[PDB]
């Protein structure tokens, strides 16, 4: 039928990382360790005949400083029309490839140690070169057909020009997946137009994901290759691998263990990441959680843990980093 | 039980001050003369067994220019857990000392003439050197024990560094009080780490407050000493005194008279403040109000009245200032 919803999530924590780019430890009050804090309004209007209209406005919440930088709806601001033909969405939102593929990340793309494949590896100059969201986006999601489902999206560059790139921000991509019972598998392909050092560059991304729920435990993995290739030659390639396992502890408790490997070709360096986490649910809305992550940078790698609100910068080349995150996540 | 609330207050007025730092009079449409305008969302989830989870997001409203500078949740953005052990709060909020002690200000820390003890007397370089709120805050409030109640708070500096200060923003403090029937008394102590002129400085603040409701009238007072002491020597000290009386006028009317004295040692100057106000309630939600304030600066003192939205800057040394504020306050 028709309804309007005002909702959100406040997830704040105490965090700690043993070293920053200067070698000092850092600790304080951070946010979004289990789920990204947010505030949004959404609705669905039944137009009759299986046809529905909907809107969704969502922005991130920063409980540690009261959204000092302001509140906005950068997470999602869409209007849509859906029916048996599927669903068409207009407005900023996660692009189809990331919306579907981040579902295989047991840490939900947030907190100190989620899957970091979706990032701006080449220091591109586009606004969303981490391949997660896009402005001026138009999406189409098919209905489900015996497990099979797909999504396609296109984002207008609107002639944003940087250096020799005159179509910065353009996105073209989609995915094909099979979701049925305990099995889920997806293949996503996408290309964005951007600029690196003022030179036209294509950001090509292929991602394969799958997970299997065995009941007593769940297995999940991600395979991704992100290649920034400049028109004039020279490219930055990075392959990311991830395998994780999740298990319920009975009394609304959950344990998670995820391993990630980032093979950064451009600098011939690797980084190993291990995240262990526990989620204790006091209710369907409120949970207590703990995240323990370790990151080992090889050679020239300088990746760092994402302790949002405390420290999410890089570290000195070849340095290892350990981080802790303990907090409360409340949904409403 | 469990509930979610969307609320706020729109308080806008017409204001006038006979002189600014240039000696000219200033008048126009201002805000928050009786209560600070705000918009917020809050909720409480009964977890069973006396245990409750809650969230509170609140930001200030500026009706005169439609929040031209943007909307945020800088007033309060917390998530909390409470039970018979008391209450623990995480996120930006009033620090325990100001939350409790400003309750003795008959003008609720807003409008042209409230108690001005909570301010940045030394021109400190910290974000919240007026000792009112704090980022990265963790608070603990005890339950009430036969009138006795206390609150403690800690705010992480997160290594904010300015000059020789490498822990700017850190807060440590709390209060002990007795609240029963017509009597209320509190003692608050707090210390913040900051920087003045790029030099590490401690902002020490001790505040004593009490009020007695005699029914026909209410008596309230505040005693405070704020001392900014630099590590390398030299300090800025100011003692603030306040005594006020409030009285109901029967038909949902209220008269208020408050006197304040600010002894600014650093500049060996004093300032006398007298505020008279009337609040006429048309309902529990809507009220009409008028504020009349006079401020007399002695010698080098340059304090000015806070006519938010019109003029809240200082005045020429030794100058007296008179201000008027008339408006409507609507809560929802």
């Amino acid at each position: 039928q028709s309804s309007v919803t005002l909702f959100g999530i406040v997830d704040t924590n105490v965090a700690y990382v043993n070293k920053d780019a200067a070698g000092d430890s850092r600790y304080g009050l951070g946010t979004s360790g289990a789920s990204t804090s947010r505030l949004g309004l959404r609705g669905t209007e039944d137009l009759g005949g299986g046809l529905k209209a909907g809107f969704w406005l969502e922005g991130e919440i920063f409980g540690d400083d009261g959204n000092a930088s302001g509140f906005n709806f950068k997470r999602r601001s869409t209007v849509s029309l859906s029916g048996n033909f599927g669903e068409v969405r207009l407005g900023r939102d996660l692009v189809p490839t990331s919306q579907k593929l981040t579902s295989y990340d047991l840490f939900s793309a947030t907190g100190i140690g989620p899957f970091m494949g979706f990032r701006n590896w080449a220091a591109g100059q586009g606004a969303d070169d981490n391949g997660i969201r896009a402005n001026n986006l138009i999406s189409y999601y098919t209905p489900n057909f015996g497990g099979f489902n797909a999504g396609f999206g296109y984002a207008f560059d609107e002639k944003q020009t940087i250096g020799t790139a005159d179509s910065v921000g353009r996105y073209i991509g989609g995915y094909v997946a099979y979701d049925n019972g305990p099995l889920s598998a997806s293949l996503g392909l996408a290309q964005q137009k951007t600029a690196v050092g003022g030179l036209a560059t294509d950001r090509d991304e292929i991602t394969l994901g799958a997970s299997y729920n065995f009941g007593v435990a769940k297995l999940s993995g991600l395979l991704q290759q992100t290649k920034f290739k400049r028109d004039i030659g020279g490219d930055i390639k990075t392959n990311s691998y991830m395998l994780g396992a999740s298990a319920p502890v009975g009394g609304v408790g959950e344990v998670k263990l995820q391993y990630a490997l980032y093979d950064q070709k451009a600098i011939d360096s690797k980084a190993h990441q291990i995240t262990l986490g526990y989620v204790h649910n006091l209710s369907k809305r409120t949970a207590l959680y703990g995240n323990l992550a370790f990151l080992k940078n090889k050679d020239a790698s300088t990746l760092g843990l994402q302790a949002k609100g405390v420290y999410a910068g890089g570290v000195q080349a070849g340095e290892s980093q350990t981080g802790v995150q303990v907090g409360i996540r409340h949904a409403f | 039980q469990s509930s979610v609330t969307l609320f706020g207050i729109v308080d806008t007025n017409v204001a006038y001050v006979n002189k600014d730092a240039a000696g000219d009079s200033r008048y126009g449409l201002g805000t928050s003369g009786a209560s600070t305008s705000r918009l917020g969302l809050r909720g409480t989830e009964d977890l069973g067994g006396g245990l409750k989870a809650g969230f509170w997001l609140e930001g200030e409203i500026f009706g005169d220019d439609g929040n031209a500078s943007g909307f945020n949740f800088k007033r309060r953005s917390t998530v909390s857990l409470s039970g018979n052990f008391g209450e623990v709060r995480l996120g930006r909020d009033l620090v325990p000392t100001s939350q409790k002690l400003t309750s003795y200000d008959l003008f609720s820390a807003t409008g042209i003439g409230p108690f001005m003890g909570f301010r940045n007397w030394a021109a400190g370089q910290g974000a919240d050197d007026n000792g009112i709120r704090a980022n990265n805050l963790i608070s603990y409030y005890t339950p009430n024990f036969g009138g006795f109640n206390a609150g403690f708070g800690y705010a992480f500096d997160e290594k904010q560094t300015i000059g020789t200060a490498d822990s700017v923003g850190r807060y440590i403090g709390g209060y002990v009080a007795y609240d029963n029937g017509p009597l209320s008394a509190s003692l608050g102590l707090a210390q913040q780490k900051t920087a003045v002129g790029g030099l590490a400085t401690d902002r020490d603040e001790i505040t004593l407050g009490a009020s007695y409701n005699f029914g026909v009238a209410k008596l309230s007072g505040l005693l405070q000493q704020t001392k900014f002491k630099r590590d390398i020597g030299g300090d800025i000290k100011t003692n603030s005194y306040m005594l006020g009386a409030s009285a109901p006028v029967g038909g949902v009317g209220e008269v208020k008279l408050q006197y304040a004295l600010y002894d600014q040692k650093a500049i060996d100057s004093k300032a006398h403040q007298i505020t008279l106000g009337y609040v006429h309630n048309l309902s529990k939600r809507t009220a009409l109000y008028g504020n009349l304030a006079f401020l007399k600066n002695k010698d080098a003192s340059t304090l000015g009245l806070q006519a938010k939205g019109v003029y809240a800057g200082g005045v020429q040394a030794g100058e007296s200032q008179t201000g008027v504020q008339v408006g409507i306050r609507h809560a929802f």
Partner: peptide, 8 residues
């Protein structure tokens, strides 16, 4: 329509 919360 009355505004509902994330769940109900």
């Amino acid at each position: 329509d009355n505004w509902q919360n994330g769940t109900s």
